[PDB]
Swiss-Prot record:
Residues of the signal peptide: none
Function statement: Motor protein required for establishing a bipolar spindle and thus contributing to chromosome congression during mitosis. Required in non-mitotic cells for transport of secretory proteins from the Golgi complex to the cell surface.
Stated family: Belongs to the TRAFAC class myosin-kinesin ATPase superfamily. Kinesin family. BimC subfamily.
Residue positions where N6-acetyllysine is found in the record: 131
Shown chain mapped onto the complete sequence: 16 to 364 of 1056
UniProt disease annotation: Microcephaly with or without chorioretinopathy, lymphedema, or impaired intellectual development: An autosomal dominant disorder that involves an overlapping but variable spectrum of central nervous system and ocular developmental anomalies. Microcephaly ranges from mild to severe and is often associated with mild to moderate developmental delay and a characteristic facial phenotype with upslanting palpebral fissures, broad nose with rounded tip, long philtrum with thin upper lip, prominent chin, and prominent ears.
Protein modification: A subset of this protein primarily localized at the spindle pole is phosphorylated by NEK6 during mitosis; phosphorylation is required for mitotic function.
UniProt-annotated binding residues for ATP: 90-97
Residue stretches making up the Kinesin motor domain: 3-325
Subunit composition and interactions: Interacts with the thyroid hormone receptor in the presence of thyroid hormone. Component of a large chromatin remodeling complex, at least composed of MYSM1, PCAF, RBM10 and KIF11/TRIP5. Interacts (via C-terminus) with the kinase NEK6 in both interphase and mitosis. Interacts with RARRES1 and AGBL2. Interacts with TPX2.
Subcellular location: Cytoplasm; Cytoplasm, Cytoskeleton, Spindle pole
Record protein name field: Kinesin-like protein KIF11
Length: 330
């Protein structure tokens, strides 16, 4: 079965949309894995758009269910020493941050499974520290967070010297599918909770970028990379080294790297040779994590409000395009 999982997640009405007495036009059916939009400016009951995906998560879907479906199979591959990428795609205010970062529950117990509102990124770190420690495998975990705007790279974690300088990138001679981003701040994570500091720094930096770059907030991609270094011995000296990399990507709604990414995924899905990784910064950076038949995931976040009709249709079309799944009968 395809190693490229494409899922749609529709959030619930917030409260503001409630004040604007927003109403629903999106029809979620997680059993048939279909999401339908009911069009009609002057009220239409003779044409509704339906899409099918690998998974459809309605408003009541809890974080752990999204995580268990999308991330678990993938983290499995990363722990085996492979490179994988999980994308979050959708316009602002649809649910990427909630899905990718979520809400913290400090002062509480845990188990990567019990955290009620933790997002993919924190929960991933949470499962990593729990899984590898229970297994008794020696490991280290470092992370980076870069931004892509107007096909230029920006380090969102570098402490000093960080008010506008670009990161440079060039292929590196010993992994033709990889590239080297010199100067890219890589922060080592000693315990799961340390990720919150990182995300805040990233967020602050992102807040500044917006005051310098027009529509940054809606035209930037972020790649949050977590590298896992593992090693197990055998009281004989036999060492097994595994280095895994998981890219958590936040894609800006289609309201360049986005164009090339859809052609690459489509190409991987259709098995067309010559996947155009080189035609954008994002696809060059992730090339080595969209390698063999590695596992890939794309979460499309949408709003259930009629007011976002066009945006939802936009997001859905893109997800549908990346991996075309034929609608079932009836
Ligand atoms: N599925 C959800 N369940 C409860 N609240 C959600 C859910 N998804 C998003 N939200 C809420 O929406 C807002 C966050 O949206 P956000 O994730 O930032 O969207 P985007 O990723 O487009 O920026 C907060 O109110 C957050 O609590």
């Amino acid at each position: 079965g395809k190693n490229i999982q494409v899922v749609v997640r529709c959030r619930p009405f917030n409260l503001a949309e409630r004040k604007a007495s927003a109403h629903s036009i999106v029809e979620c059916d997680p059993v048939r894995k279909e999401v339908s939009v009911r069009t009609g400016g002057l009220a239409d009951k003779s044409s509704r758009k339906t899409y099918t995906f690998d998974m459809v998560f309605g408003a009541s879907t809890k974080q752990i269910d999204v995580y268990r479906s999308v991330v678990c199979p993938i983290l499995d591959e990363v722990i085996m020493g492979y490179n994988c990428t999980i994308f979050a795609y959708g316009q602002t205010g649809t649910g990427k941050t909630f899905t990718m970062e979520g809400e913290r529950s400090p002062n509480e117990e845990y188990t990567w499974e019990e955290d009620p509102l933790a997002g993919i990124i924190p929960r991933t770190l949470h499962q990593i520290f729990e899984k590898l420690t229970d297994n008794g495998t020696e490991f280290s975990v470092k992370v980076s967070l870069l931004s892509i705007y107007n096909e230029e790279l920006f380090d969102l974690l570098n402490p000093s010297s960080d008010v506008s300088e670009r990161l440079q990138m060039f292929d590196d001679p010993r992994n033709k599918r990889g590239v080297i981003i010199k100067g890219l701040e890589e922060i080592t994570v000693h315990n799961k909770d340390e990720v919150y500091q990182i995300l805040e720094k990233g967020a602050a930096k992102r807040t500044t970028a917006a005051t310098l770059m027009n529509a940054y907030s809606s035209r930037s991609h972020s790649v949050f990379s977590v590298t896992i270094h593992m090693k197990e011995t055998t009281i004989d000296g036999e060492e097994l080294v595994k280095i895994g990399k998981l890219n958590l990507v936040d894609l800006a709604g289609s309201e360049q790297s986005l164009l090339t990414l859809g052609r690459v995924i489509t190409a991987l899905v259709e098995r067309t040779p010559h996947v155009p990784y080189r035609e954008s910064k994002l696809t060059r950076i992730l090339q080595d994590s969209l390698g063999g038949r590695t596992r890939t995931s794309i979460i499309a976040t949408i709003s259930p409000a009629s007011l976002n009709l066009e945006e939802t249709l936009s997001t859905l079309e893109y997800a549908h395009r990346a991996k075309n799944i034929l609608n079932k009968p009836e």
